[PDB]
Write a protein that binds this ligand. Structure first.
Ligand code: CA
Lengths: 121, 116, 123, 123
């Protein structure tokens, strides 16, 4: 589970600062600082007015961003789907048989040499 | 399952009355009484126009609410995720191999003690 | 699974015609006929502008409806949650190892009798 | 899992070009080219302002689109539900131990023949 939440809370951080690089000059509403690039991306993440409210409007300026928004969403929904489903899995549902065998082998090397040793005789 | 729905339907109640303390000064639309602080939070909970419709606007006035909304949502989605997943779990839900080998070993010590 | 989709596609039908009784007076946009009471409820079901777009506005007129919308949503999301989860359940819910071993045993009863042979008939 | 993502990323492609046939006359905002028929459908797929923002407005012109939007959504949500649930299934519900045993067997055929190799050593 929470071995993905590090990935995610860097993705969040990663994308945010591109958006703050790109947009703050013309959408300081949403992207002037991390302080709301987070909010924004949090909201984008959430799928309330991501396109019509944020993106379509971002894109009237920068078609550069078309993907920023589609990309972020796919990834965001995946790396949550991935973590979300890693709590149905890691909530609901072998090397004491390498230790069984890899001495059961040492038991047959012991026998094959305690037979080979009973051979010279 | 429903041992969480008590927690949830207090969280709902909890957050609502802060919001009615805070906002039902300047957003009596949404937060003047519980009567729509519930609705509002229900809608916030639901993620239809939570930010753009409610929060961003709440926050144009009070930036201390910034978190109220983000906090509520995280918790809300969790304590539903927790209860939701407590109905996949609370709806749905060997030594033979070791025995086969750990006497197959005792069979080869038996054989290897075939000695003079 | 589909023993609930009858319940659901009656709930849909049920609620719609109350809404068409109630509202297709004053919200014939959304509730004038089933033809968009369905759409509307489908959209309400979907949680795009259910409140701000449909309900808060329905309710400026009829506070009667406050619940219509909250009630429908709870039930709707449930009787889908119920059917949705009835396709994780009604979709979902070590032999070669016992054939490896249970002749590897027959190989060692073979050896312990191919030695019971020849220690004994050697010396 | 990804044997459905081909179906889906054709459904996406399929519907888009009907929408571009139909609408990129009168809704070139959303449907003038694939370049935003995709976006649009992506956004429709996502359920942000699909009805109120896109469809209800598409349909003020063409009521034959009524279904285009309801149909796409049902299918879209299904063929994602189908693929989504194909990663709970194909995630939830051992050949360095067929190489352990199937030479540990070849070790006991070796021994049973290096014992039967003083069995032929009486004859
Ligand atoms: Ca929405």
């Amino acid at each position: 589970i929470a071995w993905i939440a590090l990935l995610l809370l860097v993705i969040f951080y990663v994308f945010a600062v591109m958006g703050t690089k790109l947009f703050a000059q013309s959408f300081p509403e949403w992207f002037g600082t991390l302080g709301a690039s987070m909010y924004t991306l949090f909201q984008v993440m959430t799928l309330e007015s991501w396109s019509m409210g944020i993106a379509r409007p971002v894109i009237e300026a920068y078609p550069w961003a078309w993907i920023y928004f589609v990309s972020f969403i796919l990834v965001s929904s995946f790396t949550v789907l991935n973590l979300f489903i890693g709590i149905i899995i890691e909530s609901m549902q072998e090397q004491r048989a390498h230790d069984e065998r890899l001495e059961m082998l040492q038991l047959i090397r012991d026998l094959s040499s305690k037979v080979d040793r009973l051979e010279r005789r």
